[PDB]
C-alpha cells in the first residue's frame, strides 16, 4: 500500500491511464487478474506499458526471484530507490520513477 497503489483498476485501464496521464517513468501497482489476491506493477517505458507480476508466496513478496520483502510497499520502494535493480528478463533496466495517483 502507498501513492502508486490503485486497489480497483484493471490492466487495461492501467495502461490507458499510463498512456494518457503518465509519462515515461510513471508506474502504479494494481490487483492481478491472473492471480486474484496478488498485485501487478504496470510501468510506462519506451513507447508502451510493461506489466510485472509480484509473487506473494504466502511468506513473502518478490518478483518471482530477486530480493524478498515482507510487505508489498517494501518491494516497490526498494526498486524505486535502488538504481539498476529492476531489469527485464533480457537485461533492459526498468525505471520506477513517477508514482501515479
Amino acid at each position: 500500500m502507498r501513492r502508486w497503489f490503485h486497489p480497483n483498476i484493471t490492466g487495461v485501464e492501467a495502461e490507458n491511464l499510463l498512456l494518457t496521464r503518465g509519462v515515461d517513468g510513471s508506474f502504479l501497482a494494481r490487483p492481478s487478474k491472473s492471480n486474484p489476491g496478488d498485485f501487478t506493477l504496470s510501468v510506462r517505458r519506451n513507447g508502451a506499458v510493461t506489466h510485472i507480476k509480484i509473487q506473494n508466496t504466502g511468506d513473502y513478496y518478490d518478483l518471482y526471484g530477486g530480493e524478498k520483502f515482507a510487505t508489498l510497499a517494501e518491494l516497490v520502494q526498494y526498486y524505486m530507490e535502488h538504481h539498476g535493480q529492476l531489469k527485464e528478463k533480457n537485461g533492459d533496466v526498468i525505471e520506477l520513477k513517477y508514482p501515479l495517483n
Partner: peptide, 9 residues
Amino acid sequence: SVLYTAVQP
C-alpha cells in the same frame, strides 16, 4: 488481460 514481462534478478 495484458502481456507480462519477466524480470532478471
